[PDB]
Amino acid sequence: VSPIIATILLIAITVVLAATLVTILGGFTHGVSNTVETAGVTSHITSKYIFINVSSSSSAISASSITI
Amino acid sequence: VSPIIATILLIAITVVLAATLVTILGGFTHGVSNTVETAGVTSHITSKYIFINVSSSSSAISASSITI
Ligand SMILES: *[C@@H]1O[C@H](CO)[C@H](O)[C@H](O[C@@H]2O[C@H](CO)[C@@H](O[C@@H]3O[C@H](CS(=O)(=O)O)[C@H](O)[C@H](O[C@H]4O[C@H](CO[C@H]5O[C@H](CO)[C@@H](O)[C@H](O)[C@@H]5O)[C@@H](O)[C@H](O[C@H]5O[C@H](CO)[C@@H](O)[C@H](O)[C@@H]5O)[C@@H]4O)[C@H]3O[C@@H]3O[C@H]([C@H](O)CO)[C@H](O)[C@H](O)[C@H]3O)[C@H](O)[C@H]2O)[C@H]1O
Numbered sequence: 001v002s003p004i005i006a007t008i009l010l011i012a013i014t015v016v017l018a019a020t021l022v023t024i025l026g027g028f029t030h031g032v033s034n035t036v037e038t039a040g041v042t043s044h045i046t047s048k049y050i051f052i053n054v055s056s057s058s059s060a061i062s063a064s065s066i067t068i
Numbered sequence: 069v070s071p072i073i074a075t076i077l078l079i080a081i082t083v084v085l086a087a088t089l090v091t092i093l094g095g096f097t098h099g100v101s102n103t104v105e106t107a108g109v110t111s112h113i114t115s116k117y118i119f120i121n122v123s124s125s126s127s128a129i130s131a132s133s134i135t136i
């Protein structure tokens with residue numbers, strides 16, 4: 001009797017460890033993305049205005065997505 | 069994995085630098101031309117008239133292109 005019952009208990013424990021491991025991995029598998037951007041920018045500053053002129057960029061992006 | 073991805077990023081950066089350089093060169097490659105002219109001119113001045121008589125010139129040019 002007892003060696004089979006001990007085996008059933010060890011299977012039950014194994015599933016909870018595997019379920020625990022899955023929640024540990026979830027802290028690694030997020031928030032990685034390609035955020036690199038590169039632009040040719042020139043600028044001139046005066047007592048009233050900043051002028052900004054763009055010559056090229058790595059990608060086309062919305063002017064609302066850029067913070068100054 | 070990562071050495072190939074790093075290489076792809078460096079190619080993307082390289083193109084933006086080359087595009088930047090092309091706009092720098094554009095400030096040199098304009099406004100150079102052969103503007104030299106030379107004429108045999110004689111003149112006489114009076115209380116009412118200036119007389120101007122031309123004997124030869126380096127090229128034939130319109131009288132509207134000359135400022136006095
Ligand atoms: C999962 O997989 C999916 C499918 O592939 C997506 O890829 C998803 O990624 C998300 O997608 C959503 C939806 O595309 C993104 O939400 C958008 O976020 C942008 C911000 S962003 O910087 O431009 O990138 C915008 O906020 C966008 O909103 C649009 O709609 C706004 C409201 O317009 C709605 O209502 C008007 C009436 O008032 C209707 O006429 C119109 O048709 C539409 O229904 C606009 O205001 C907005 O304009 C400006 O928005 C931002 C400022 O907020 C600005 O930066 C922009 O440049 C632009 O000038 C823009 O036109 C979001 O889209 C969703 O739109 C729904 C709407 O119901 C239509 O479905 C909501 O109302 C919200 O507006 C918004 O959720 C999200 O960013 C992505 O992560 C993957 O995760």
Ligand SMILES: *[C@@H]1O[C@H](CO)[C@H](O)[C@H](O[C@@H]2O[C@H](CO)[C@@H](O[C@@H]3O[C@H](CS(=O)(=O)O)[C@H](O)[C@H](O[C@H]4O[C@H](CO[C@H]5O[C@H](CO)[C@@H](O)[C@H](O)[C@@H]5O)[C@@H](O)[C@H](O[C@H]5O[C@H](CO)[C@@H](O)[C@H](O)[C@@H]5O)[C@@H]4O)[C@H]3O[C@@H]3O[C@H]([C@H](O)CO)[C@H](O)[C@H](O)[C@H]3O)[C@H](O)[C@H]2O)[C@H]1O
Pocket residue numbers: 130132133
């Ligand atoms: C790119 O490559 C091309 C091809 O090689 C050229 O080399 C180009 O260089 C430019 O070329 C253009 C065109 O030739 C040049 O523009 C001329 O500029 C001169 C000034 S200049 O000092 O003489 O060198 C003139 O302004 C000339 O205009 C002529 O036409 C005028 C208008 O006449 C038109 O309309 C009447 C009706 O009213 C028609 O009857 C007529 O047929 C014609 O269609 C005339 O007024 C003008 O007379 C006087 O002009 C100047 C004073 O402005 C004076 O200095 C002259 O001595 C002369 O007495 C002259 O006859 C310009 O030619 C263009 O003509 C077109 C017209 O549509 C015909 O195509 C426009 O209407 C303009 O008149 C003008 O653009 C330019 O200078 C060069 O840089 C390279 O860059």
